[PDB]
Design a protein around this nucleic acid. Sequence first.
DNA 1: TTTTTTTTTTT
Lengths: 194, 608, 196, 137
Amino acid sequence: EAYFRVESGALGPEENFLSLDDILMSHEKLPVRTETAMPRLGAFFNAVPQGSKLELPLWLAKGLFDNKRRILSVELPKIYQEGWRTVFSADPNVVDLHKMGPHFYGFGSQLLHFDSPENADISQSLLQTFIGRFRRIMDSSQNAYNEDTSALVARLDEMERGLFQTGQKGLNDFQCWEKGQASQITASNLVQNY
Amino acid sequence: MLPRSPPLPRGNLWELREAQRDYLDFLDDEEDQGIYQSKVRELISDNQYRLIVNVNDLRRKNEKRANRLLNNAFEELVAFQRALKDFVASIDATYAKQYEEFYVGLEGSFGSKHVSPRTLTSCFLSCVVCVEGIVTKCSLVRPKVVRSVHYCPATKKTIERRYSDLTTLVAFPSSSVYPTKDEENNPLETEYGLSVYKDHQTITIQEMPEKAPAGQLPRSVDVILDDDLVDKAKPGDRVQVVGTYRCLPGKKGGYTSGTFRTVLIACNVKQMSKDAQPSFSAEDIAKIKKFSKTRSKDIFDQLAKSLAPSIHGHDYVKKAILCLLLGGVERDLENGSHIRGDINILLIGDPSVAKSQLLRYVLCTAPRAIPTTGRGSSGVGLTAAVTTDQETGERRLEAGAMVLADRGVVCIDEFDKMSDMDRTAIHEVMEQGRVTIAKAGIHARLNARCSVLAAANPVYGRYDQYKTPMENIGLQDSLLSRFDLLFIMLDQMDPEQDREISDHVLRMHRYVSAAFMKKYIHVAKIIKPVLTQESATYIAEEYSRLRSQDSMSSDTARTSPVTARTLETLIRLATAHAKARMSKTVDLQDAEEAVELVQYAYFKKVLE
Amino acid sequence: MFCEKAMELIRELHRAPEGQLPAFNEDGLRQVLEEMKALYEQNQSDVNEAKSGGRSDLIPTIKFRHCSLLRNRRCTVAYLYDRLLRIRALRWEYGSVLPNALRFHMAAEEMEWFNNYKRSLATYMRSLGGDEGLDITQDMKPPKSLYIEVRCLKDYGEFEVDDGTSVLLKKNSQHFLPRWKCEQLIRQGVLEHILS
Amino acid sequence: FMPTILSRFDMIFIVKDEHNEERDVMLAKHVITLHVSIDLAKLKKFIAYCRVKCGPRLSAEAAEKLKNRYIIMRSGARQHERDSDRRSSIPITVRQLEAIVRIAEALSKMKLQPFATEADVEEALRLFQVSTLDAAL
DNA sequence: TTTTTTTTTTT
Ligand SMILES: Nc1ncnc2c1ncn2[C@@H]1O[C@H](COP(=O)(O)OP(=O)(O)O)[C@@H](O)[C@H]1O
């Protein structure tokens, strides 16, 4: 109630520095093709050729990128390719955005700092998927009371679980006021140890 | 894993007037990129009834119609197939009359419709669905009338009649009375040549085994194929039918039970598994014609080195197994004779020399390979056995192992734990190439042109290196002639070899291209080289030197007898060595590549 | 790639999203400072070596190492900063003094941060009003009535009433006290508000 | 029992029966343990997560450990079988070597340790020196 | 969709 973690800026211009969600977000891998040799460090993948397909975290490919593609170029995973961008248009209420994740909107908004050609078509997928999956999170979260919700929440990602936990915290708080139950003073964080 | 599209989305790169006038506008397709005007013409040049559509396009073009088509499939598919005949008459009206009616399949990505026969509830009635699963039966293809043409011999007129049943998209039950006197005065007579019939089948999809909750008997569903979709599915497949869902009522005696039977009126079929590798790229064929030209000296050896890297030693055996994977050339003379074009390999040796490994690799490399053991295989269960049916009760001939694997490979491990009465059932199917059965009420001859790869443990448990090669093998000299290559994988206890063997296996436990031999041999198989008189006089000499005992050696025993049957195994190994080079003419460098193999595989040495 | 050790500091705090202070990790922290030093020197070598022979083709091998320390900096300040949030809560929820099931999980320098924060807070609080300001720590829920009925749950030496009129607190013995005093103890676990 | 169906395994334990009267005190104990009538209920749910999260392989040093153990295991079987050859025996085979490797994997999976080392190879080899000498006798 | 009798293939 007073532990206010630093929130995630993974949807705006640039992720926050201290947010433990973005730190684990950017760690996810991404495919690149190198433009030069990689001397003195070919141990991991001593030198590495130019024109080689490698898998690197996102944070690494932040500074190793330039406009001229001096060191390496990037190509998007298939989840954001043209293939799946039609699937997410058929009916977005069917996809398991936890397997295709578990950071869909967080990752996809950082792949816009690579000035690829099809950006005007990724920032339209996300917008049209989130709008598609809305009337199923506005209604399965404000209307699921004293139920086992661990199956209404099995196909969501970190940007959506944060909302499914705000619908419930406002349902279970009006239903606790209606029953004269939110008058008793209780232990706040000690019942967490118990 | 959820199949939310017939095209696997991961790696695809490597009144009723509005509907009819919107479908036509969609089928124009000219002004944006001409995607369908490139397909209507394409099918007219192939004489097809139906064309496959992508609903993914209908969405981008018009969302309202794309939604109204996945929820009222009948009234929309009777308007699609009308405004398709309309658009084919707008190209070639002469063609637009050859066929009674056109059809239109579907494919793409339906939102929640991708269901299994287990999830197909009764909220999908009259809605395009896309069912996946295994076919587990078929029906007998039968005609079904859709129009008659009658004739009056008295009045010289000609009346017609249009038919319709509950398996249409319009569903009016017409009676098949076949009018014989429309007006009581004149008599009629049907004309079958001018009427119109169509085909009709009925298959049964069943839920996939590894998707069932395993507690029950997995659910099923009934499909009604039609109009040249008919034979597109055999029992044991993995199909993705895309068809409307329908309930068909009935009444026995003016009193109907509410219970109905629901079927799926298919309008497309897709085999999910890709079961061939002919789709080589032009870049691939370019690579192939490069590699086949680079060096003609060392391409066979270079091919065989890369065969099974997971195994150390046994270069000769890999060479011969490659020769197997290629094959010879089956000559059939003019009078009707026939000479086989396959190679049958036998491997004997002490335990743990990677024999089973070579077998399990040859299984996966070649297409159409069948495995078999030496005790889980009877002499009749290998070739063909007589049985009956449960529905009809009349006998038939169930095909054994070595008849399913036609034009393929059969891998028999522990070929020695097979009783004497069971080997004998092979002597006809290993050389003559076809099985003959004369049982009680069955007289048949099945084609079984295949090739045998067999592995046998020697007698005495281990190969006593002192007795002789003939006493270590139990096979009689009649079966030993069929197998044209006998490899004694002798195991030796010198300390050196074990060192590198351990190095190799341990490196393997710390983890030419692999997926290129597939295409390369699938291509070089078809070539049919022809002998030349420069080598044909060299083989006709190496054989007559093999057949003479004196020229062999002393202190050297014979593993198998040299007959006039090893002569045309020389010829087979040769024209299978000039198939890697894609050469098309065998030369003296071939008829010498295939003689040392023999010189090594035939004669063994005895110690004391 | 790199940074497989720092990412074992974070992937542990991310498993406790309730706000419960886990045991400090001096081990992994030392283990990542060591890698920082190692890469630092092994890169500075070739840095000054690219001015002593002209190996400018090593410029990539600088960034791949220059940035790959910034990471190990982020993932060691965030962890060190996150744990400074889950601590300040223990001043708004438990109280001014903590039981040693907590003061045993904080690293020995976080106690100094605490005793600084607590003291600055108690300084600010007394500054609001004329007479010893207003203790804003209490009063977390709107007041409903003027007296409350509590019921003890553990032993507690001798609770005080302002007028010097103490009250013993045996187990399972309920009083009727002004809620102006019982708030401190209800919110910890000693008493209990029964007559809701 | 053929030397081949026997060799289809990798570990032979000739179980022994003790009839000692202190062993018989253990038996008298076990009597009433039935006359009256780390937990499995969590051991199973531990294995269910251990099997599915570890990807162990061998490290470079275990390789040269096993090579020199196995070569010297082979190197004497010759002079063993060339003279006595008592119509039956059991020598080492590469299948048994692969068994050793897949045993070391299962040992180093107890610890979620993604890389095995000399920490357990020698004790596994001694366990096997028991298990092969059993079938030798 | 059951017994009983008789012939032939199969484990
Ligand atoms: N020369 C070799 N190269 C690679 N692996 C080998 C070799 N010899 C034995 N092995 C390994 O030892 C085991 C031998 O089993 P296998 O040879 O298939 O038994 P059998 O010879 O009775 O069929 C296999 O797992 C194989 O990987």
